[PDB]
Write a protein that binds this ligand. Structure first.
Ligand SMILES: [Zn+2]
Ligand SMILES: [Zn+2]
Ligand SMILES: [Zn+2]
Ligand SMILES: [Zn+2]
Ligand SMILES: [Zn+2]
Ligand SMILES: [Zn+2]
Lengths: 214, 229
């Protein structure tokens, strides 16, 4: 299949600056390239078709260049309405293929997260499950990593996390991670910790509790 | 003018078949190819195939030949109304996503730049029926220090289908709240969290309660969050 590589993965900017998403193709494709804007809970919006044709209803600040294997989407006067995901699409060969997508953020000062850990509650351990929850509150940039350790044993595969929309007033993010276990395995070990890595943190941050320590 | 209305969100158990109908309006139906694209939440976009609404022929990507069939019905009476249905057999974990319906720009029947989309049709594949959530408190642990500000919340666990609403203090408390996107568990049941940032002194002196409403199950619940000692 024709692979399409987008760059960058993220792109932070403030209103007014100009942006440039580029989409590389694994092989030549005349000018059969399209661009789509994508917002949460909304259908994809076509910005450009045939590599350079601006679609109707799309502002003149959107523009698409490129040809062969290097194509670009440009937004001169970036505006609040333009913060969203953008994807490139090739139709020179079937099957159609898209790029991984670019996230267009809103830049601000780096802000490290406030890290909180929550142990499983009274009520839930009588039901038969243990849910340890780790909160990373009001941080930026969006890229952040969480590792879970029990008795310092690195946990894998038994965790899920969620990230919120970029807040429209602090322009920050928040992240929730849930480590789910059996009540049997929860009562097996003592220390539960949530290691957090981010650009705004000198070194890894670790929040923990001791199972049963008052 | 142009409009593409799709099915409402559907919930199927593994191995079953799903059908997503898309009704086109506002243009000559037999003059444009309809395409189908899946949006999987974590990953990206996926092309499923395309149908020639005139002759009814079907073209699909290899990943789906033999598992999916596109069929169109042209309207008895008028050329500006038609419906295209999609049917995917033996659905599995990998198939949960928002299935979109769209038609090409005028003149691009041979390609696939899609100008007009349907609202989207979420189809979740889970081994589960409608269920009400269990709501557990989340508070800082017994010997937990949080310099400056502290946090608490509600874990809304094991519910199906989406969605739920989560307020705090019946609305009076809104500053610092973060309610997170639900996550679908390997159980086929949804789990969600809603936390709030609060001063360390206030913890233990103010009444904080989460107000949950899972309308699909008729479940309404209020839970007081309190740190223990
Ligand atoms: Zn050419
Ligand atoms: Zn214009
Ligand atoms: Zn979670
Ligand atoms: Zn264990
Ligand atoms: Zn580490
Ligand atoms: Zn907060």
């Amino acid at each position: 299949q024709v692979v399409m590589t987008q760059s960058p993965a993220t792109l932070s900017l403030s209103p007014g600056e100009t942006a440039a998403v580029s989409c590389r193709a694994s092989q030549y494709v005349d000018r059969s390239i399209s661009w789509y804007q994508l917002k949460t809970g909304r259908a994809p919006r076509l910005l450009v078709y045939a590599a350079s044709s601006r679609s109707i209803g799309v502002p003149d600040r959107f523009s698409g260049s490129g040809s062969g294997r290097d194509f670009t989407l440009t937004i001169r006067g970036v505006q609040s309405d333009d913060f969203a995901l953008y994807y490139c699409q090739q139709d020179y060969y079937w099957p159609v293929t898209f790029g991984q997508g670019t996230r267009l953020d809103m830049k601000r000062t780096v802000a490290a997260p406030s890290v909180f850990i929550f142990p499983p509650s009274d009520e839930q351990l009588k039901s038969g499950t243990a849910s340890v929850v780790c909160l990373l509150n009001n941080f930026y940039p969006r890229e952040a990593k969480v590792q879970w350790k029990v008795d310092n044993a690195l946990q894998s595969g038994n965790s899920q996390e969620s990230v919120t929309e970029q807040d429209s007033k602090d322009s920050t993010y928040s992240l929730s991670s849930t480590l789910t276990l059996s009540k049997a395995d929860y009562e097996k070990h003592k220390v539960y910790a949530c290691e957090v890595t981010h650009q705004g943190l000198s070194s890894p941050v670790t929040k923990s509790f001791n199972r049963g320590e008052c | 003018q142009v409009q593409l209305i799709q099915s409402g969100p559907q919930f199927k158990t593994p191995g079953a078949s799903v059908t997503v109908s898309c009704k086109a309006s506002g243009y000559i139906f037999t003059d444009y190819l309809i395409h189908w694209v899946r949006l999987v939440p974590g990953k990206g976009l996926e092309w499923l195939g395309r149908i020639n609404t005139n002759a009814g022929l079907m073209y699909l990507s290899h990943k789906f030949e033999g598992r999916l069939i596109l069929r169109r019905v042209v309207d008895w009476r008028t050329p500006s109304l038609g419906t295209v249905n999609m049917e995917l057999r033996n659905v599995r974990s990998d198939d949960s996503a928002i299935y979109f319906c769209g038609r090409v720009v005028d003149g691009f029947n041979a390609a696939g730049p899609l100008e007009f989309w349907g609202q989207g049709s979420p189809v979740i594949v889970s081994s589960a029926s409608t269920k009400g959530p269990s709501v557990f408190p989340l508070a800082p642990s017994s010997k937990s220090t949080s310099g400056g500000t502290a946090a608490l919340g509600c874990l809304v666990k094991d519910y199906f289908p989406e969605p739920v609403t989560v307020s705090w203090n019946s609305g009076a408390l809104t500053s610092g709240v973060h309610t997170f996107p639900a996550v679908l568990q390997s159980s086929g049941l949804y789990s969600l969290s809603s936390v709030v940032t609060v001063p360390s002194s206030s913890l233990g002196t103010q009444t904080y309660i989460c107000n949950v409403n899972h309308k699909p199950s008729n479940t309404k619940v209020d839970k007081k969050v309190e740190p223990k000692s």
